[PDB]
Design a protein around this ligand. Sequence first.
Ligand SMILES: *[C@@H]1O[C@H](CO)[C@@H](O)[C@H](O)[C@H]1NC(C)=O
Ligand SMILES: *[C@@H]1O[C@H](CO)[C@@H](O)[C@H](O)[C@H]1NC(C)=O
Ligand SMILES: *[C@@H]1O[C@H](CO)[C@@H](O)[C@H](O)[C@H]1NC(C)=O
Ligand SMILES: *[C@@H]1O[C@H](CO)[C@@H](O)[C@H](O)[C@H]1NC(C)=O
Lengths: 99, 274, 120, 122
Amino acid sequence: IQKTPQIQVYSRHPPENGKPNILNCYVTQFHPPHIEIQMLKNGKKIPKVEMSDMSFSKDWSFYILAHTEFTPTETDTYACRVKHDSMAEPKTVYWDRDM
Amino acid sequence: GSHSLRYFYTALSRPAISEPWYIAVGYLDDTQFARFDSAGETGTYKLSAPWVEQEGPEYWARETEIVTSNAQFFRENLQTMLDYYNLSQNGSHTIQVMYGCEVEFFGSLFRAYEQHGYDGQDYIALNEDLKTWTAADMAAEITRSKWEQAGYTELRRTYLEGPCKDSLLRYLENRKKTQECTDPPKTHVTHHARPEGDVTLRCWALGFYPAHITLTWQLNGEELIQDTELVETRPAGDGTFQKWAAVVVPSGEEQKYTCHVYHEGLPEPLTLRW
Amino acid sequence: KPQAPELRIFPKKMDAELGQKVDLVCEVLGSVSQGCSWLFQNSSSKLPQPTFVVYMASSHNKITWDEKLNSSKLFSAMRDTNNKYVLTLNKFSKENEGYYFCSVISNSVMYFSSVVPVLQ
Amino acid sequence: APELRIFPKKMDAELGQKVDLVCEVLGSVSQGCSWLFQNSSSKLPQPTFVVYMASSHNKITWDEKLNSSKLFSAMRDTNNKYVLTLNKFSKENEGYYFCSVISNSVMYFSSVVPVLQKVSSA
Ligand SMILES: *[C@@H]1O[C@H](CO)[C@@H](O)[C@H](O)[C@H]1NC(C)=O
Ligand SMILES: *[C@@H]1O[C@H](CO)[C@@H](O)[C@H](O)[C@H]1NC(C)=O
Ligand SMILES: *[C@@H]1O[C@H](CO)[C@@H](O)[C@H](O)[C@H]1NC(C)=O
Ligand SMILES: *[C@@H]1O[C@H](CO)[C@@H](O)[C@H](O)[C@H]1NC(C)=O
């Protein structure tokens, strides 16, 4: 009846220490469609994050893209935490420049 | 070569609250051109592509009330399923519908479809002949009877082979105007020290369009299909997509591996070495 | 890799008379796998034993047939619309009667569709 | 074309016992070996993936659907002999096992080894 969210956290363009960029949080494979997606800065929930219109795949599981602005720093932790009924606990995935 | 026009409806049935009840999104291939939703007496719309404005406010106003009327119909058929399995009506449920058509200028192939899913599971789908339906459970067999009796199947076939197809070829002509044919991928390969020894060679493809693409790793001409890690193709956020393929290689043997990128916006497959 | 591709095969069953054409469709959902292989288990085998029929690349037109079937005319392979792969039994025989299923690989793990009985 | 040889030829297992399956890959192959099996008490013989062991480097990938890493141990030596040991035979592991290698896009299979429950008592 319900599937659990798969999450990818990455940047629009090849990351470059100090240089400005965009952080994406792509949440897929979930059901029901009711979800909560938060983009964070050093553990501090980032503000006004834009979202795309929700759609779904052939297996009926939904997908959404939350995205904001950020500037890659070796001393800066960025992550995406999502809350969905299918999981025992919220799930956080950190941005990792290698992926 | 093959282009599609598809509508993705998500309606929510919750007799216990307000109603941001339905959203419907339309795509031309992998690009959304519009979003309709119930916000408005008969919904409202919001375009997202240049080659769509050419239609005019009158057109999009009519297109919106049609989508809304479809959404109401889609949602109402849920009832057949609730009565059969005798579920409560105040309970919450989800209704999803995807329909559309595609053309393959090459061999001018045409295909269409319409599939309904209730609570995240298959319910009923239109067959390739556009004249019969495949039912997923017993309740859907009731729905199938009702729709043939009502003439719903022919209405859809007429819409699919008529305006859906007409709209796809038009919207397509339109796009050729502003946006270019396709969008080739920019490629390059990174590496990564593997904590367990050896290295991971990662082949990236970014900013491509459409979303379909194939990224492969080879060694002495063989596709390393079972030592290749692929991530799900994902949106760059600017209407473009990205993907990467990784392979773990034994230390010192990097230069032996090559990455192959296949994409329609490339007259020929791209080959990249470490 | 938690996220697994999903395989859907059609039809779910087939009762074929000798001579008839039979198309088996393998629809692969997701984008975490590339290409598709068709496997066969002879009904003419009381003990299970899979046999590679063919591999269709997701690339462009690149088809690799099992060495014996390399020059056989009982089978034809065609990559159709989207991630739909078609294995066609040109002439239904006792020679290709049995159990069919597709398989794709994703991040080193082999995934398999339902097996479909193509019996007389 | 590589050749996959498997041993033993069959296994009549007593509940709770350990059982080793070995696959020797003969030929030139760049990819690793996969262990699969079709359960015996099931009509439609759909294979179940157990594990894959890379050949040119050290990396093992387990089925995470059933979490097979919890019931099996898997190893390989530098001479292309891959070992899979069922640590404690249970009805749920009963089946026809086989190994697989892919070389130049062709999937090759070893013979099928029945690992069936043997009755212990006279
Ligand atoms: C298999 O058959 C094709 C066409 O019949 C032939 O061109 C090819 O050389 C044969 N061997 C291969 C490449 O599998
Ligand atoms: C089993 O299938 C093979 C193809 O893999 C076919 O050549 C063979 O004739 C079949 N076995 C028989 C003869 O029943
Ligand atoms: C095979 O594995 C077990 C034993 O029958 C069962 O859980 C499963 O449904 C069976 N069928 C398959 C191949 O999934
Ligand atoms: C596999 O095992 C892990 C760790 O023991 C567990 O967290 C996970 O839920 C299991 N996956 C299943 C049962 O599919």
